[PDB]
Structures are given as C-alpha cells and as structure tokens.
Design a protein around this ligand. Structure first.
Ligand code: M61
Length: 301
C-alpha cells in the first residue's frame, strides 16, 4: 500500500497540468509519519518539515490518503489541493504544495496551524474563550466564507472541526474535502457520507448545494461556537433530521448567546434559500454585534 503506483495518464490532463505547477520536490519534504495531527474521510494528517527556496525549515501539515483503492480517490484528493492553490485571504487556509513521488499516495502540504481545530480549541478548559472571543471567531469564519463565495466555490462541509487557529489566533476555513467549483451554474449537484446535521433542508432533499446552503451550515457553525463545541441535535438521529426541519424545529438558543446573534442563526436556517442573508450581510451583521458587545476578550478578529 506504501508501494502504490499512480498512473498519471488515467487522470484528467488539466488536473496533472494544475498539480505540476504546485509540485513540491520529494527532496524538500520530511513527513513525520510517526506524528498524526488530524484525521478525516480521506486519511491522516502528519507533522511535516518543508525546506524553502533558500533552506529555512518550515513547519507544516501533510495530508495523505489512507487506503488507495481506485483512481477516483486520487483525482478527488488532488482536486482539493488544486481548489486551494489560488486562495489568498487571512481566514482561508492556503496550499503550500503537492508532493507526488514515484510511489505512495500524493501528499497535500499545508501551513501548520499551532492551536489546531476550532471545535477542540473552544472545548478546551485552559483556553476558555469569552462570549466576545466566540463571536469574533464567528466573524472570522464569515469573512473567509464571503471570500470563498465571491470565488464561486461551495464548501458543503462547513463545521467548527474544519476550521483551524494559527499562532496569532486567526481562524481559517481549513478543510476543503467536499468543496466544488460552481463555475457559472450557481450550484453543485452530487453525482459521484455527507454531514447531515450541518446540511440545509433543500440539500438533504434535492442533493443540490449552493452558497445559501453554506449559509445554513455557517448558522450551525455559529451555534457550535456559542455552545462551546456541543454536538447539534444530540437527541435527533441522522435519518430523522429532514422531517424534524420540515416541522419548523431548529437548534435552540445557547445559554450565554446574545439575542441578536441567535436571531442571525435563525435567519441562516430560513426554509426558503433566497430569504437567507448573504455572507456579505453576515459579515456586516456579525461585525455590528461584535463591536457592540462589551465583555472581556483577548484575541484580535
Ligand atoms: C479537519 N480535520 C482535522 C480534524 C479535526 O478534528 C480532529 C481530527 O482532525 S482533517 O484532518 O480532515 N483536515 C485538515 C485540514 C488541514 C489541516 C491543516 C493544518 C493543521 N495544523 C495543525 C494541526 C494541529 C493538531 N494539533 N495541533 C496542536 C498540537 C499541540 N496541541 C495543541 C494542538 C495542531 C492540525 C492540522 C490538520 O490536521 C489539518 C487537518
């Protein structure tokens, strides 16, 4: 399995051409394969060492595929690396490069995020973020999402688990495993495991995803923030969620969440997609709530 050989000819030429101009030479990368830092659908994430244009040791995160059975898995994995190549926004994680050696899985090289994932960070009783800190994290995610939507990319997997915090406490949308280019169509329909509890009503029904269905997921992400990383609908099973939402039942107000912030969450979960605020409107509304909330804080958002 470490001896897997990828036939580049079986992949789309545009993708190989795309991977070619972001390729990291195998000599420039040290994967700390005995140091797992993240886990997802695709595989594991490892502590890594990148040697820059000169020779300075850059600390990084290395994504790898777990069990490579088919070429489609490789094609999907390389597509996520490609989607990230042109990202340039402080609230979006950038691509350092792709290492594709003679044997083994391709490696997606990413900048190392010191404090790890947003969900675990907010659940940690040593970090203890204030109500204002949590709002600030929400604002940062909204900004990143405004940028991704303006580039016509639909995330489809927005959750606190998929966001990371660097050394300066800057929140970044980090995982792009389910992300898809909308091109000009203003949507994405499944063709080829989805996170049900963060999905918009219309997406559970029609399998179609948009910026407005990402807005729904942002609302859930906001709820996770204010509850300090609690699972949504814990007493509702995955399979019953569609009926539960058609009946008009939503996630209830967290114990220390301001009234206008919960009002924003409810707007994100509006049954009619057109009615939901845009990410532009969310940035402005959350910015106003943040700046007018006078409570203790630490970080800069
Ligand atoms: C969302 N997933 C992570 C999930 C989150 O839920 C838990 C399982 O992994 S996933 O693996 O699918 N995608 C990604 C996507 C990008 C990254 C990028 C950078 C990254 N940087 C630091 C840390 C780190 C990890 N820990 N630390 C610090 C180490 C010292 N203690 C404080 C945290 C830094 C972990 C990561 C990652 O694993 C990572 C993971």
């Amino acid at each position: 399995q470490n001896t897997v050989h990828i036939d580049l000819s079986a992949l789309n030429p545009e993708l190989v051409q795309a991977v070619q101009h972001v390729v990291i030479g195998p000599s420039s990368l040290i994967v700390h394969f005995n140091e797992v830092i993240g886990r997802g659908h695709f595989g594991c994430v490892y502590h890594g060492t990148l040697l820059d244009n000169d020779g300075k040791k850059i600390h990084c995160a290395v994504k790898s595929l777990n069990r490579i059975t088919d070429i489609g898995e490789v094609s999907q994995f390389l597509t996520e690396g490609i989607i990230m190549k042109d990202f340039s926004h402080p609230n979006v994680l950038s691509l350092l490069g792709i290492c594709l050696r003679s044997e083994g899985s391709p490696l997606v090289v990413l900048p190392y995020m010191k404090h790890g994932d947003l969900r675990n960070f907010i659940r940690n009783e040593t970090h203890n973020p204030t109500v204002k800190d949590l709002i600030g994290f929400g604002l940062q995610v909204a900004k990143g999402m405004k940028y991704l939507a303006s580039k016509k990319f639909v995330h489809r997997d927005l959750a606190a688990r998929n966001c990371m915090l660097d050394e300066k406490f800057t929140v970044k949308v980090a995982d792009f495993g389910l992300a898809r280019d909308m091109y000009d169509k203003e949507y994405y329909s499944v063709h080829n495991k989805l996170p049900v509890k963060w999905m918009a009503l219309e997406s559970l029904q029609t399998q179609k995803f948009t910026t407005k269905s990402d807005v729904w997921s942002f609302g859930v992400l906001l709820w996770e923030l204010m509850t300090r990383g609690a699972p949504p609908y814990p007493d509702v099973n995955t399979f019953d969620i569609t009926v539960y939402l058609l009946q008009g039942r939503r996630l209830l107000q967290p114990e220390y969440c301001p009234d206008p912030l919960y009002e924003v969450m409810l707007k994100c979960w509006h049954p009619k997609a057109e009615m939901r605020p845009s990410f532009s409107e969310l940035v402005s509304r959350i910015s106003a709530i943040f700046s007018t909330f006078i409570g203790e804080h630490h970080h800069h958002h």
